[PDB]
Amino acid sequence: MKYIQTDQILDIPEGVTVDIKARVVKVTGPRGELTKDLKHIDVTFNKINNRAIKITVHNGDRKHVAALRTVKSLIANLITGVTKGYKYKMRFVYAHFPINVNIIKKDGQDYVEIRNFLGEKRVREVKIHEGVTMEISSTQKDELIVSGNSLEAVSQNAADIQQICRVRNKDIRKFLDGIYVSERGTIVEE
RNA sequence: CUGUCUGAUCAGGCAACGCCGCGAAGCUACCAUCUGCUGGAUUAUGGCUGAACGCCUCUAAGUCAGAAUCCAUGCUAGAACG
Ligand SMILES: [Mg+2]
Ligand SMILES: [Mg+2]
Ligand SMILES: [Mg+2]
Ligand SMILES: [Mg+2]
Ligand SMILES: [Mg+2]
Ligand SMILES: [Mg+2]
Ligand SMILES: [Mg+2]
Ligand SMILES: [Mg+2]
Ligand SMILES: [Mg+2]
Ligand SMILES: [Mg+2]
């Protein structure tokens, strides 16, 4: 239909300074800085004031309009990543074989080392992404805490850990073992 | 070793390689021995963030892993007008 104009309004909290130049967003907050390139989308930005930014698509068709609120949401996730952080909690689910999860360091790199998953002799290693912190929860038994400023990196590490512990050649309705994301929140509770 | 021929011996010739045992060298046999590499990108699929569609959603923009697949690495030839 070629909608003449579609708009979205970013909301910038008090301590945050968004910074956009040629579709390269640099969001700065108390918790650090996050950057994102949006050069694959045709959008324009207008600073209404220090607390609002207009995101506009001119003469966009259905899909190009659809790509507008996703731009808004990505920048909003950047904003809330540098002011509240992100925290994904993973629970260790096993029927018989305890899952032995350690945070090891080999070759100067951090790894999450899963052992004894379903009794297997194989040792699973998941590389920890830059800017992402892993921790074995003390307050909860069999819990892994994935935290960081970037929601994408945090959720992708959580997904890596969950996906590497898939059950093969069994009825997965019966063999429910694995490591699953149980809580998706923020570092700073609200 | 047989037959025959050189008078015998010694030493030999022939039997349309005379026949037999062993037989080096060379060739050769899963009938012998040795050797047959590790990276990236993907398919199906399972996912992340995420709109459309105030929710949801692996998908639309973007993105992760991933097959005996593919492209390299490696291996053979080297364009007889590179
Ligand atoms: Mg099956
Ligand atoms: Mg079975
Ligand atoms: Mg004669
Ligand atoms: Mg004759
Ligand atoms: Mg012989
Ligand atoms: Mg062999
Ligand atoms: Mg999701
Ligand atoms: Mg796919
Ligand atoms: Mg796509
Ligand atoms: Mg030549």
* Alpha carbon of A155 to ligand 3 centroid (Å): 107
Distance between Cα A76 and ligand 5 center (Å): 91
Cα–Cα separations (whole angstroms), residue A24 to A62, A85, A182: 24, 21, 33
Q: Are A114 and A124 within 8 A, CB to CB?
A: yes
Residue A14 CA to residue A180 CA, distance in Å, equals 35
Å from CA of A162 to ligand 4 middle: 96
Is residue A133 classed exposed, middle or buried when 0-12, 13-18 and 19+ CB atoms within 10 A define those classes? middle
Q: How determined?
A: cryo-EM
Q: Which residues pair with A69 in a beta bridge?
A: none
Distances (CA, A) of A127 to A7, A74, A114, A131, A165: 39, 24, 12, 12, 14
- What is the total residue count of chain A? 190
Q: What H or E segment, with its residue span, contains residue A74?
A: helix A62-81
A65 touches strand B (CB under 7 A): yes
At what resolution in Å was this solved? 2.3
Structure tokens at A160: 């890596």
Q: Which residue type occupies A64? A: H
Instruction: Round to whole Å and give the CA distance between A155 and A68.
Output: 22
Q: Degrees (nearest 5) of the Cα angle A110, A162, A81?
A: 65
Q: Is the CB of A182 under 7 A from strand B?
A: no
* Length A39 CA → B33 C1' (Å): 64
Angle formed at CA A151 by CA A150 and CA A157, multiple of 5 degrees: 95
Q: If residue A162 lies in a helix (H) or strand (E), which one and from where to where? A: helix A151-164
Nucleotides of B under 7 A from a protein CB: 46-52, 60-65
